[PDB]
Ligand binder design. Structure first.
Ligand SMILES: NC(=O)C1=CN([C@@H]2O[C@H](COP(=O)(O)OP(=O)(O)OC[C@H]3O[C@@H](n4cnc5c(N)ncnc54)[C@H](O)[C@@H]3O)[C@@H](O)[C@H]2O)C=CC1
Ligand SMILES: Cc1cc2nc3c(=O)[nH]c(=O)nc-3n(C[C@H](O)[C@H](O)[C@H](O)COP(=O)(O)O)c2cc1C
Ligand code: SF4
Ligand code: FES
Lengths: 430, 85, 213
């Protein structure tokens, strides 16, 4: 297959994405959830890990690490400590609102994903670290978890399989850094959401010091559908090493901002013009697209014409796939103001632990606040570039990377607009 | 730790008193500022014995090797968990 | 906006705070979610519970959470100053949180911030004199396709216009509760000009299930 997109409704994993059907247990079982879950649990951890490895599922959180290879890090005998699946439901990325839709509208799909994934990794329980701002979504998920306990689907003898498995929901308290997996682990442990240094990876030392896999809501909730439909079904979509379906959040300057499930390697132009109603003012009104939420560098209209929305084609477009959160910016956008607001986000959402982010993200925000007004000189552009390169790769977690990358994308694609901003400041203020 | 690499020979500190005019530190010890540098202990001992100086030798105190593990900050059942970070 | 505490007569370690007994049963349920020997893991919910009982956190809720969980009080102060939901000052009864990050700023959240400011007569960070509304300006609330949106105490109010948020503030002042959803024609997150997807009925249990299962 060479062309991708135009995903059929029979191949959707997240049916009832839009809240048009019953999210509760009767509606979930009438859509295929909790079907033959006992037969999945009784085929063992190795079969489930083989299905997830065969499916080509990569991490839907945004880095795209191979999910079966990641979950097989727990496939090892116990050493006295319990094992834990932890579901990352924080979702603090600007642009990204898909895990809210999974929790709010398909909650039993997430609970069955917790059960299947925790059986695959031998986990004792699931801690769903949900964002504290998602209060109605958290109570929604708790009603579904009560329905799953009262039906015997989780808990003591989950689905009649002889495997005991709890599902806990921990609410956040307003920190974007608490979606980073080790900072999330520290937030569950009752501390400041500061990321741990890796190694130890959480499969060695995770939550409470136990073996732990932190996995996104989307990569957890697709796993029962992967175990039922088969890994060869899920690997039949998208390009190679880019398998499956993906939730896309097209927001910003489109006619119809929406969340939509779509095949993996869909063109960005096809996605925007088909599901979002196109850019406001036509496709010729397009200035830039942040392809995968705030941490990915922007790409201009010349790149957006032919680019595919998977991991590898956006890496070749020197950006990232990320959370697949498409932020569309038309020609009327002050793009320096938008990227500087994004850097303002990253200094308000920075836990202050390590020196390059704690100091340099604030210093990049001050430089970007002067670049919006033009109150600068062009030698400070490359300077800012070097400042971003002194944050990238030198920090504890990738929030420093995710703050350096929008600066780098803005400089790389819009240096002349920065320069004409500064020179018109210089000619009307001197 | 770069100032802990070489051996030093100093002498016993003698009397420092107050200058009556200015309050300055007056001394009558010529050897009060004499600090000699040696690569080994035996070179310093040979130099002190060669010059008739009665000496006392303190052995080099190296810091013993520590067992450092960042994962020990987050143990399951040990007291070495950090309460904050 | 400060991260030190100074004792005031309305915020001091002798300010009266104590949980209700139903809140103690809720705290016992929270503590039972975590392994034995890791009761400190209940710092973030229980302290948030202390914010749901009181509306905000004086430094007796922090000290009570430190006392009943047997954690040092500094380790509760770290949590209360780290996380942006813990109100360490008394906020109004309706805590309006306007998202002004880039996906909401592109869809004109500044017009709604200005509409709330000229409706309530306050600015960002201030509280109305009848203690009903606190207007602050927050980061991405995770409702980006429903931009522009606000949050009022638990609830998202989405796809807003200035007229819609004026209507929401009017029925908050009138004692009623508004409906937490998009104020445009759509329901949650679908395309506004009709469904571009999921128009077929869902297939049901057993569809596409592979052999050997
Ligand atoms: N979904 C969201 O709301 C957000 C997502 N992101 C995304 O997060 C990504 C960066 O996240 P990180 O987890 O910090 O980076 P990533 O490099 O480390 O790692 C992703 C996952 O792979 C695992 N992993 C990677 N290398 C490993 C190894 N050698 N051994 C064992 N496990 C290994 C990690 O434990 C982690 O769970 C970015 O691509 C960004 O797009 C960023 C912000 C918000
Ligand atoms: C600053 C920062 C914030 C993150 N926030 C989230 C998040 O909110 N939700 C999420 O699923 N992943 C988030 N991630 C990515 C996680 O670290 C981790 O890769 C992911 O949650 C679990 O891996 P997975 O993609 O295989 O599911 C964040 C990463 C960083 C650096
Ligand atoms: S880079 Fe920033 S977000 Fe990460 S540990 Fe350091 S201060 Fe925290
Ligand atoms: S940008 Fe305002 S909700 Fe995400």
């Amino acid at each position: 297959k060479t062309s991708f997109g135009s995903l059929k409704d029979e191949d959707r994993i997240f049916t009832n994405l839009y809240g048009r059907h019953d999210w509760r247990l009767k509606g979930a079982q009438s859509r295929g959830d909790w079907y033959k879950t006992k037969e999945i649990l009784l085929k063992g951890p190795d079969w489930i890990l083989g299905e997830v490895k065969t499916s080509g599922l990569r991490g839907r959180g945004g880095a795209g690490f191979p999910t079966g290879l990641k979950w097989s890090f727990m496939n090892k005998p116990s050493d006295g400590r319990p094992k834990y699946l932890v579901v990352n439901a924080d979702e603090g990325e600007p642009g990204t609102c898909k895990d809210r839709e999974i929790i709010r509208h398909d909650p039993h799909k997430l609970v069955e994903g917790c059960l299947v994934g925790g059986r695959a990794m031998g986990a004792r329980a699931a801690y769903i670290y949900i964002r504290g701002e998602f209060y109605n979504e958290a109570s929604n998920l708790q009603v579904a978890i009560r329905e799953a306990y009262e039906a015997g689907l989780i808990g003591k003898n989950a689905c009649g399989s002889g495997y005991d498995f709890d599902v806990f929901v921990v609410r956040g308290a307003g920190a974007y850094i608490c979606g980073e997996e080790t900072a999330l682990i520290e937030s569950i442990e009752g501390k400041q959401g500061k990321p741990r240094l890796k190694p130890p990876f959480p499969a060695d030392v995770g939550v409470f010091g136990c073996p732990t896999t932190v996995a996104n809501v989307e990569t957890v909730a697709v796993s029962p559908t992967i175990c039922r439909r088969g890994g060869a079904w899920f690997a039949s979509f998208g390009r190679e090493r880019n398998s499956g379906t993906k939730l896309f959040n097209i927001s910003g300057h489109v006619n119809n901002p929406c969340t939509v499930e779509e095949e993996m390697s869909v063109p960005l132009k096809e996605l925007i013009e088909k599901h979002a109603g196109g850019v406001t003012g036509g496709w010729d009104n397009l200035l830039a697209v942040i392809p995968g939420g705030s941490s990915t560098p922007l790409i201009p209209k010349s790149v957006c014409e032919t680019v595919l929305m998977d991991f590898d084609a956006l890496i070749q477009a020197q950006t990232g796939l990320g959370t697949a959160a498409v932020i569309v910016m038309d020609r009327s956008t002050d793009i320096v103001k938008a990227i500087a607001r994004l850097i303002e986000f990253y200094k308000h959402e920075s836990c202050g632990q390590c020196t390059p982010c704690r100091e340099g993200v604030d210093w990049m925000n001050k430089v970007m606040a002067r670049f919006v007004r033009g109150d600068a000189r062009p030698a400070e552009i490359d300077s800012l570039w070097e400042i971003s390169k002194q944050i990238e790769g030198h920090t504890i977690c990738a929030l420093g990377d995710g703050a350096a990358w929008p600066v780098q994308g803005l400089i790389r694609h819009f240096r002349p607009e920065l320069e004409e901003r500064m020179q018109r400041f210089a000619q009307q203020h001197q | 730790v770069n100032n802990t690499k070489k051996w030093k020979m100093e002498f016993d500190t003698r009397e420092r008193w107050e200058n009556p005019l200015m309050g300055w530190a007056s001394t009558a010890d010529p050897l009060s500022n004499l600090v000699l540098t040696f690569s080994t202990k035996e070179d310093a001992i040979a130099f002190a014995e060669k010059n008739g100086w009665s000496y006392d030798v303190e052995e080099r105190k190296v810091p013993k090797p520590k067992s450092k593990s960042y994962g020990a900050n987050f143990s399951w059942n040990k007291r070495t968990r950090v309460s904050t970070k | 906006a400060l991260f030190v505490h100074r004792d005031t007569p309305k915020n001091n370690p002798e300010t009266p705070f104590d949980f209700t007994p139903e809140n103690y049963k809720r705290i016992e349920a929270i503590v039972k979610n975590y392994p034995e020997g890791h009761k400190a893991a209940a710092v973030l919910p229980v302290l948030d519970l202390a914010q749901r009982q009181n509306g905000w956190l004086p430094i007796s809720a922090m000290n009570k959470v430190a006392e009943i969980l047997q954690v040092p009080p500094m380790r509760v102060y770290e949590v209360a100053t780290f996380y942006t939901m813990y109100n360490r000052k008394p906020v109004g009864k309706y805590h309006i949180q306007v998202c002004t990050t880039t996906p909401c700023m592109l869809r004109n959240s500044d017009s709604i911030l200005e509409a709330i400011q000229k409706k309530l007569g306050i600015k960002v960070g201030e509280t109305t004199p009848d203690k009903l509304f606190t207007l602050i300006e927050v980061e991405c609330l995770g409702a980006c396709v429903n931009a522009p949106m606000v949050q009022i105490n638990d609830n998202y109010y989405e796809d807003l216009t200035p007229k819609d948020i004026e209507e929401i503030i009017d029925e908050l002042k009138a004692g009623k509760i508004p409906k937490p959803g998009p104020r445009s024609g759509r329901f949650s997150c679908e395309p506004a000009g009709g469904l571009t997807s999921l128009t077929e009925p869902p297939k049901g249990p057993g569809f596409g299930v592979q052999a050997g299962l």
